[PDB]
Ligand binder design. Sequence first.
Ligand code: U2F
Ligand code: MN
Length: 542
Amino acid sequence: MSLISKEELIKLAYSIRPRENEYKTILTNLDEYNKLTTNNNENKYLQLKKLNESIDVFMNKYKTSSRNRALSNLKKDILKEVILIKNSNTSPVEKNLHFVWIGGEVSDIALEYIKQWADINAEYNIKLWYDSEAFLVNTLKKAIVESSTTEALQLLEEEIQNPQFDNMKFYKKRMEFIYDRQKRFINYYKSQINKPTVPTIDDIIKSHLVSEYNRDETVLESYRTNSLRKINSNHGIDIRANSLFTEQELLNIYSQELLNRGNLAAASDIVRLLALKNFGGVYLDVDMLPGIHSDLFKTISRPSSIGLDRWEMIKLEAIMKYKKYINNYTSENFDKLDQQLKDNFKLIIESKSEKSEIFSKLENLNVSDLEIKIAFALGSVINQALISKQGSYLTNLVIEQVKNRYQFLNQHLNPAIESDNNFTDTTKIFHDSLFNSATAENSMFLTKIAPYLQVGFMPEARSTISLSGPGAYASAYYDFINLQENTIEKTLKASDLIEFKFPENNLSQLTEQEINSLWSFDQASAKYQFEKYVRDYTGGSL
Ligand SMILES: O=c1ccn([C@@H]2O[C@H](COP(=O)(O)OP(=O)(O)O[C@H]3O[C@H](CO)[C@@H](O)[C@H](O)[C@H]3F)[C@@H](O)[C@H]2O)c(=O)[nH]1
Ligand SMILES: [Mn+2]
């Protein structure tokens, strides 16, 4: 299904005025798009983009020309053509399953989740990416946070007891102690990393922990070697041995999250894009599970008292109550069911004997070389599940989004950091520079990355979404769909992206492990944590 012909547009866009130079260029660009000999998707997309740009040139210079009605209609057809190109030359994505666990020992629970994908898709090659030099990053982060927690409680000992105490005062003061301790580590790291002994990240962390956190070198080394052994025995593949990092800029971004911030989710955000770029296939967070067979429970009616998400959780709890594929999976929600419902679940679940009659196989996941598919959550894309052919056009758009976003971040953040001010004063310098570059186009992005330094340590610090996370994907989707580049303002949402959705029957997101985030926490979690901190420090309560 092609575009209108040049001759058709001449009739539709007819004017009594002579043909402007900009219009003759549209007509040539349209004609050449229509006469393309190639079947290369990227070639067709780029010619389509050239055409679209040439239409915008005309329409912005002659905002009154009568031609704009037919040109506007052509623009709408061009958008549809993008989808037609995308849904062409499709073939099965490379049969790789990519997982990422960086910063410490991969947990048994994570391996149980991975096992479900392995059991069901034996033909897929499983790659569990890790960083061979960085098994002590999580240990360091926990040591920093726990020491800072104590310093903050001591400092606020008289005030934390108040029933009127805003626990945010604890989190702000603890963040000051966290930031100083991170600086202490980073400066030590900088003093070691260029030595001719060429120490590793873990060499440096271990020395820092031994001398500054009263840790035992041999215990840390045992944890390090056991983490390496465990992951290598469970599909482990080292990012540092597979040329994922093909340029210094991407290594620097990965490193600033791994080392300076201790944000392993952000580090994982970078690795998964490079793995899909270089190998193609499916990326999944370790808390994702296979999709349930489309009709396994169609016969069971969800009661009106249970929401849609809670019902999806219940289906999984039911499967696990009766098949125990995953050791001790929660039944918190399934156990509250009316008995007739529990018995209906048991009947269906136990009627099936093969795991692949409960869960869906991936089989062939047909995609084109232009696209990436993504899961949705709460109205937005969420990059916890991805599908992409190697070298795909859209995956490269996301990578450029990420690089541009960190370029802007670091331009304003690096001067603030290099001032060696405390957390509060560093934040001010960062913010003052950041917001002096504000425009209508970038103001939302700026506000979302302003609390960057707090991510992982204070409630609702979510800058990662707009740097390496969903926000970079959503803007890349806007670029692809609208034939733009370097979009920072507009992000496409779930309702815009049905053409790019990770197929719903191939993914169960509402898992027990997904409920909780490992790089962030919300206000209710902050209260729960503060109460526990107060307990453990004073020996009291409340
Ligand atoms: O100690 C650690 C802790 C976490 N990770 C990596 O971070 C990934 C996501 O962590 P997690 O599921 O706990 O946080 P979540 O809030 O759901 O992440 C979203 O936001 C994240 C940030 O954009 C995004 O990565 C994710 O896809 C979203 F769902 C996890 O699957 C690992 O690959 C790690 O390697 N080592
Ligand atoms: Mn998760």
